[PDB]
């Protein structure tokens, strides 16, 4: 009657961040006397009654301040969602861990035999910067530079564009993650670059001012 549904292992790069789905199913006498529903998630091997949880929804149990912010459990408890959203990954992160309900003094267990394999890689990925692909000369356009798999979850990332293109402006509006010019004809073929820092990932792009 206790079972819990979820992949056995994950991955995802440093820095980036990834939805674990998951779901979780426990007895339920069901009449009026509904208790509050409590889960958690542990770091594997953490006792229950004395750790605090990288992720719960109960508002007492302290969240371990590394994960604060960043582990947080998506979808609904009381609709057997035990989906869990990792943001901004670590290499710390990486581990073993499972999850836990509580409700009543009767409902109480750890899903021990489905923990959660989370392992962190480098990062790989680049930023990306896109646009409507104009390209002309005495003609403003914006560009949006991003990093793919990301989220708003920790320090938010820092944008600055580099290149010969970005004399021709203010050095202060080249921090937004979007940006426009009036590409002139010597930008055209020129470097620009888009680097990111969470509070070494850059991408440059040959300018086809036309
Ligand atoms: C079965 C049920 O209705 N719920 C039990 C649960 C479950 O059996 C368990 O969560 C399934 O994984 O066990 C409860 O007690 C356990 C709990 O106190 C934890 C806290 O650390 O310890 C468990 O025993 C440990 C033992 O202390 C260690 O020395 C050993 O290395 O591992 C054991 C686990 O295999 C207790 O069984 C619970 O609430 O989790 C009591 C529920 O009634």
Known sequence: VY??????????????????PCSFSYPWRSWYSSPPLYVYWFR?????????????????????PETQGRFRLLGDVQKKNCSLSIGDARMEDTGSYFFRVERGR???YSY????????????????????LEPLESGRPTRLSCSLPGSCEAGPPLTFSWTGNALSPLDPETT??????????PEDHGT????????????????????
């Open 3 to 20: 079972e819990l549904q979820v992949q056995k292992s994950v991955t995802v790069q440093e820095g980036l961040c990834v939805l674990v």
């Open 44 to 64: 594997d091997g953490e006792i229950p009654y004395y750790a605090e949880v990288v992720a719960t929804n109960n508002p007492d149990r302290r969240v371990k």
């Open 106 to 108: 009767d409902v109480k």
């Open 112 to 131: 021990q035999q489905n923990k959660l394999n989370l392992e962190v890689t480098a990062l790989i990925e680049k930023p990306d910067i896109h646009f």
């Open 175 to 184: 921090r937004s993650s979007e940006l426009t010019l009036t590409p002139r």
């Open 191 to 210: 470097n620009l670059t888009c680097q990111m820092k969470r509070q070494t990932t850059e991408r440059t792009v040959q300018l086809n001012v036309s």
